[PDB]
């Protein structure tokens, strides 16, 4: 299955570079930002379903789920929200939906905390604090399942998904963690971070843990 | 992606019918049989790799993993063993590899315990004690990933896999549990059954648990 390549809007490329290189101290803020986006995407399918209830049937359970995959050094953040079509992935994540972007970079230069990133509406990119690569796997009721992929470079790919588990509906952020950021694979560390900055999340936050039976 | 349909050898069809309809009491024995097959498949890749070490590289971790999926009423038993090519799935699971089969049915008629099924080499089919449908997802180093599927009828399908997560190497038995057998989705029940009939398994048996953070 053939990938398509797209160019990032230039300011997004600049932002990713700022973020993936920054020695900023509180890298854990990425999880709050991603849970927040997850929650918003869920709000959206729930709101849409007020007038179109069958939109829920592709996945009636509304949840946020976090899945460490230690062997692959991967952390997945999944939700059963509204999801994104191919065109939404291209539009929302790369070729446009910007500044926010420029204004946040200006705030940064002036001394603003990276944690403000979500107030500028670009909190997604905070994932580069702990990951050097990301796959966004998404299924909207309106399209097939697709994979958007970026390594913080100036270009991203979008590929029809024939390799991942089917999601009924929603989105998975598959983070390929940096070698020094593997603590976010750890149950206790993950739990600690979640409890700290996400008390008023209306959806279940599920942690998937692998335990050896003895 | 187009499925291919195959006919079961007739005695296998008879065995599945005996098993899926039986009111036998100790249905939990299926897990021992499947963990045993998992362990054997792992022995095989480990033995093969003695003289061909790179056979391990597609998935260097040797494990058995059990994953309840409550919403789908599914239980998955995964291993990173040798796996099966398309032709092996067809051969090993349906169109041949038999009696065992007939001899076990004869032993059953005479009064033998269903738990002897593994000593006749057909323990795989014990899964129909608790499931009315099964998908066997397999990746051998020698072939693409494939899905073999059966509902205990006289025919099964084999389909090139473009819908499930990639496994590096090995096999997943995806059991669609009967409505009265949902206890095997439960962490405590699963743990209890494992500990009982599998103390001398040389590989880690991992249980995947989903816990809501609070
Ligand atoms: O407020 C929702 C919006 C769209 C709805 C769909 O979004 C999503 O699937 C989604 C998700 O489920 C988890 C995530 O980490 C992210 Cl980055 C996204 C996509 C965005 O948020 C991009 C901007 C649009 C805002
Ligand atoms: O002894 C191994 C054999 C083949 C090697 C590969 O088997 C496997 O992938 C495999 C597994 O990983 C888990 C399972 O529940 C089952 Cl049913 C199988 C397939 C069989 O056992 C069928 C008979 C052949 C014996």
UniProtKB/Swiss-Prot annotation, chains A, B:
What's the impact of mutating residue 22 to I?
Answer: Induces a 6-fold increase in ATPase activity and a reduced client protein activation activity, leading to growth defect at high temperatures
What is the induction note for this entry? Answer: Expressed constitutively and induced by high temperatures dependent on transcription factor HSF1. According to PubMed:2674684, it is constitutively expressed at low levels, however, due to the specificity of the antibody, this result is unsure.
Q: Where in the cell is it found?
A: Cytoplasm
Query: What does the record say mutating residue 81 to S does?
Result: Reduces client protein activation activity, leading to growth defect at high temperatures
Q: Which residues form the signal peptide?
A: none
The annotated consequence of residue 107 to N reads: Induces a 6-fold increase in ATPase activity
Q: What is the effect of changing residue 41 to V?
A: Causes a 98% reduction in ATPase activity and a reduced client protein activation activity, leading to growth defect at high temperatures
Instruction: Give residues annotated as binding ATP.
Output: 33, 37, 79, 84, 92, 98-100, 119-124, 171
Q: How does it assemble?
A: Homodimer. Interacts with the co-chaperones AHA1, CDC37, CNS1, CPR6, CPR7, HCH1, SBA1, SSE1 and STI1. CNS1, CPR6, CPR7 and STI1. Interacts directly with the substrates GCN2, HAP1 and STE11.
Q: What does this protein do?
A: Molecular chaperone that promotes the maturation, structural maintenance and proper regulation of specific target proteins involved in cell cycle control and signal transduction. Undergoes a functional cycle that is linked to its ATPase activity. The nucleotide-free form of the dimer is found in an open conformation in which the N-termini are not dimerized and the complex is ready for client protein binding.
- Protein family (similarity comment): Belongs to the heat shock protein 90 family.
Q: What else is known?
A: Present with 444943 molecules/cell in log phase SD medium.
Anything noted about its domains?
Answer: The TPR repeat-binding motif mediates interaction with TPR repeat-containing proteins like the co-chaperones AHA1, CDC37, CNS1, CPR6, CPR7, HCH1, SBA1, SSE1 and STI1. CNS1, CPR6, CPR7 and STI1.
Its protein name is ATP-dependent molecular chaperone HSP82
Which organism does this record belong to? Saccharomyces cerevisiae (strain ATCC 204508 / S288c)
Portion of the full-length sequence here: 1 to 214 of 709
């Amino acid at each position: 299955m053939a990938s398509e390549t797209f160019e990032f809007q230039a300011e997004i490329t600049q932002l990713m570079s700022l973020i993936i290189n920054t020695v900023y101290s509180n890298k854990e803020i990425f999880l709050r930002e991603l849970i927040s986006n997850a929650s918003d995407a869920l709000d959206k399918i729930r709101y849409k379903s007020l007038s179109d209830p069958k939109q829920l049937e592709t996945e009636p359970d509304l949840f946020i789920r976090i899945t460490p995959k230690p062997e692959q050094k991967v952390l997945e953040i999944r939700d059963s929200g509204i999801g994104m079509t191919k065109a939404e992935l291209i539009n929302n994540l790369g070729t446009i939906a910007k500044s926010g972007t420029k204004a946040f970079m200006e705030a940064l230069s002036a001394g603003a905390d990276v944690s403000m990133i979500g107030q500028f509406g670009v909190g997604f990119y905070s994932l580069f604090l702990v990951a050097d690569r990301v796959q966004v796997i998404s299924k909207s009721n309106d399209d097939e399942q697709y994979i958007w992929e970026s390594n913080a470079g100036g270009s991203f790919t979008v590929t029809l998904d024939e390799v991942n588990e089917r999601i009924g509906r929603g989105t998975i952020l598959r983070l390929f963690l940096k070698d020094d950021q593997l603590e976010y694979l750890e149950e206790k560390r993950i739990k600690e971070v979640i409890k700290r900055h996400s008390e008023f999340v209306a959806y279940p936050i599920q942690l998937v843990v692998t335990k050896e039976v003895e």
